[PDB]
């Protein structure tokens, strides 16, 4: 998943055909480098370019589309970002571009153009946005929700994984390592339970919609029949039909009351039969989940989280021996730190210091990336910020750990405003402003 090249145009502060490729000697020597410059020069921009080219979205912008597009540099015509990446043994190419109304500095925004293709093959694997997203997700093994917290750690949201609610935390572990059927079966179970419950409710509505004559009304009507019949036997033609007409009125009402009761009795028998089934349906729903994997998805993913924390423990011991991580006895998917020096303290991650929380998040990200090494291997990492909160006596250990990781084929590119690593890192991509003109540039070797 290591990135091979980058190409951007009119993105944020940067303006004009800046292409960098890691196949060259300075980046292929070791694969580890650093980026520096003034704030706002484009340090985050040249790292968000690959994120845009891969997933059509940035950590700072919810979406880019035919409307509300503002990532292009002010007063420019076309902005594009193209990257080349190698998954398994073959390299691919991802492309994104956007044009104004007529290349003028103002006007309507046009629909984006996206192309995902294999390098040196000429095969356009996808030509539409949704198809491109599906294909790139399938081939890379990384959706945006997995990439933005397993491969790239943007500033400000580095602690998001530790501070993520289980509703969004469990989905990542579900997407990784397969096993997507749990949420599906939970949603289907909830849907069928809702159907089997709403079918019973309408029977209750029919149950309470049938008018029933009261027993007092029933007896009073029956009593009138005897009165009408007895007065008849006491006999003229006028009162014959008079009693007889009232006799017919009562007979139908009793017949209708019996018919109303007859319909109710059958329906109550039916209601009783499917009531016993819906009881078990609700009981099952109470421990299998509802809608978007509300329950039992965390139950299934607890084992994956246990494996992830087991790997994170052994990686964090190598990083630094201050804390160990393990799952806490809570219903939610949570991990709590263990104080090695105290050897007994069991405290949640909410009380950690800023630097220790950053280190824990980095360790979790590294272990999570290494967990899925079996399928769609990941051999890259980027850190926008986080080293500032660390002191010099620990930042050195952090850099030593990153060097130990980079000793393998993994490539790590960090960004930091702290000058304590300007000599530790040999390669620096210097970025410079231009006389306060509102734009920025970099080394001429990468310009085109």
């Amino acid at each position: 998943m290591k990135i091979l090249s980058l190409r951007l145009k009119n993105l944020n502060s940067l303006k004009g055909e800046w292409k960098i490729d890691f196949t060259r000697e300075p980046f292929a020597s070791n694969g580890l480098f650093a980026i520096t410059g003034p704030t706002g020069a484009g340090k985050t921009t040249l790292l968000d370019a690959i994120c845009l080219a891969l997933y059509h979205e940035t950590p700072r912008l919810s979406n880019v589309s035919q409307s509300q597009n503002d990532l292009m540099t002010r007063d420019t015509a076309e902005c594009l970002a193209e990257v080349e990446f190698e998954v398994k043994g073959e390299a691919y190419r991802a492309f994104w571009s956007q044009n104004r109304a007529r290349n003028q500095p103002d006007g309507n925004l046009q629909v984006p153009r996206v192309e995902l293709a294999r390098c040196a093959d000429g095969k356009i694997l996808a030509d539409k946005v949704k198809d491109k997203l599906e294909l790139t997700a399938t081939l890379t093994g990384l959706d945006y929700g997995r990439f933005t917290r397993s491969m790239l750690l943007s500033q400000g949201q580095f602690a998001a994984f530790l501070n993520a609610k289980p509703k969004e935390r469990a989905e990542l572990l579900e997407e990784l390592t397969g096993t997507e059927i749990y949420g599906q079966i939970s949603a289907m179970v909830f849907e069928q339970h809702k159907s089997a419950r709403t079918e019973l409710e309408k029977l209750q509505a029919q149950a309470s919609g049938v008018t029933l004559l009261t027993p007092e009304q029933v007896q009073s009507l029956t009593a009138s029949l005897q009165v009408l019949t007895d007065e008849e036997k006491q006999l003229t033609h006028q009162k014959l039909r008079e009693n007889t007409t009232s006799q017919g009125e009562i007979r139908q009402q009793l017949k209708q009351d019996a018919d109303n009761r007859q319909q109710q009795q059958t329906l109550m028998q039916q209601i009783a039969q499917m009531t016993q089934q819906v009881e078990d349906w609700g009981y099952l729903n109470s421990l299998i989940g509802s809608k978007e994997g509300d329950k039992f998805r965390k139950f299934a993913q607890g084992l994956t989280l246990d494996n992830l924390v087991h790997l994170a423990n052994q990686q964090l011991t190598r990083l630094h021996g201050r804390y160990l991580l393990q799952r806490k006895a809570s219903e939610a998917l949570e991990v709590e730190v263990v104080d090695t020096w105290q050897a007994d303290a069991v405290r949640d991650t909410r009380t950690l210091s800023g630097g220790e929380s950053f280190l824990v998040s980095l360790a979790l990200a590294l272990a999570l990336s290494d967990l899925v090494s079996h399928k769609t291997r990941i051999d890259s990492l980027f850190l926008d910020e986080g080293f500032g909160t660390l002191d010099s006596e620990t930042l050195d250990t952090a850099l030593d750990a990153l060097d130990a990781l980079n000793a393998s084929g993994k490539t790590i590119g960090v960004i930091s405003h702290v000058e304590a690593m300007k000599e530790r890192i040999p390669v620096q991509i210097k970025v410079k402003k231009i006389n306060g003109l509102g734009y920025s540039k970099l080394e001429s070797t990468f310009a085109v």
Binding site: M188, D280, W281, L284, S286, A300, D306, N307, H310, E331
Partner: protein, 381 residues
């Protein structure tokens, strides 16, 4: 001399959105009738006259009607301040209650007062101590500790009681008149008041405990208790009000008076069958005022739609259901699984068996649930 010992009226209290005005008025008229029958001279209430700082209007109307009706008998009334109530809400009527031969002692620092008998002779000496808010007796000091505050407050309240008892004794001088002292504090989770530190007064009126009882086994320290039940833990217990016989400056005896239960209450515990059996016993009698009932279900099964099933069970009887409870506390999780199992090679049947193993069902609904999940699984193949 006879005096009534009561407290914790809690006028205007809302009990699950149900008013207590009817039972409070019933108790007020019953107490007035008992006072007229027993020919009392002074009545003392030991705090918590109003449930909240700003009681509703009807509670104030009830209090005014009670004081007006008590004015007819000519007996004296003493009103103590609690912790729940408002000292300002008591003082706004303390000034005007003086003309009615009733005293409100909500404000701290009240001097001892002589309780006159019906014949005009001095009957007893009051020690009307309301609830002692820390803001009225102590001063804040820096350099403190976590537990030093409790000891300082205890010392301050003990000193206040000692000083007030000494002042009352020196005011009564040598006449053989009984000494009465009020109180609205708990007496022996390390927050209490030692029993032996009370001054050796003739009789101590202590409140703020809804269960009437004796403290330390000493006869002249008593808890009056609530006049009416205020929760479901005292529904089946009879409330009491104390009358005290005083003569020649010494206590003789006290007798408990049962409070009529105008609004009966009961609580139920058990599974569905037991609850239904206990609820159906009300079919014989017909309670014109509805009886308030509590349901405490202790079982493990689901009981789908409790709020509708209970309503259906109680629709045919004048039994007002107020609250329900179930033993819902339960935790669920996959165990360590030997630190080796993984979700990829694990089976959905195995995880379902593990999930159901945590539940207490064994075979009866277990087989039906397993068949149900097999049917659910079969529709995605």
């Amino acid at each position: 001399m006879r005096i009534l010992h009561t407290s914790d009226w809690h006028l205007g209290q809302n009990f699950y959105s149900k008013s207590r005005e009817a039972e409070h008025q019933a108790f007020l008229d019953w107490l007035l009738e008992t006072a007229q029958t027993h020919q009392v001279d002074a009545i003392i209430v030991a705090g918590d006259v109003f449930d909240t700082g700003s009681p509703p209007s009807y509670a104030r109307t009830l209090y005014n009607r009670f004081v007006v009706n008590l004015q007819q008998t000519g007996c004296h009334l003493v009103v103590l301040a609690g912790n729940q109530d408002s000292v300002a809400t008591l003082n706004e009527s303390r000034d005007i209650m003086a003309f009615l031969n009733t005293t409100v002692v909500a404000s701290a620092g009240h001097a001892p007062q002589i309780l006159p008998r019906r014949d005009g002779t001095p009957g007893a000496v009051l020690c009307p101590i309301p609830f002692l808010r820390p803001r009225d007796i102590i001063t804040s000091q820096a350099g403190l500790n976590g537990i030093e505050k409790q000891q300082h407050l205890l010392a301050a309240i003990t000193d206040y009681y000692q000083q007030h008892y000494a002042d009352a004794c020196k005011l009564r001088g040598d006449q053989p008149l009984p000494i009465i002292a009020t109180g609205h504090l708990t007496t022996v989770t390390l927050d209490a008041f030692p029993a032996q530190n009370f001054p050796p007064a003739d009789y101590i009126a202590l409140g703020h405990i809804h269960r009437a009882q004796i403290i330390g086994g000493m006869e002249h320290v008593r808890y009056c208790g609530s006049p009416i039940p205020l929760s479901f833990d005292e529904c089946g217990k009879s409330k009491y009000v104390h009358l005290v016989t005083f003569s020649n400056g010494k206590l003789e005896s006290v007798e408990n008076l049962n409070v009529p239960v105008t609004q009966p209450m009961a609580v139920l515990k058990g599974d569905l069958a037991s609850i239904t059996a206990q609820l159906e016993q009300w079919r014989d009698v017909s309670q014109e005022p509805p009886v308030w009932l509590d349901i405490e279900i202790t079982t493990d099964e689901y009981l789908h739609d409790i709020q509708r099933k209970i309503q259906a069970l109680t629709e045919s009887l004048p039994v007002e259901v107020l609250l329900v409870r179930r033993s819902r506390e339960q935790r669920e999780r996959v165990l360590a699984s030997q630190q080796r199992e993984t979700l990829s090679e694990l089976s959905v049947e195995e995880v379902f068996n593990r999930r159901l193993a945590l539940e207490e069902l064994d075979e009866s609904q277990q087989q039906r649930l397993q068949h149900l999940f097999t049917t659910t699984l079969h529709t995605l193949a």
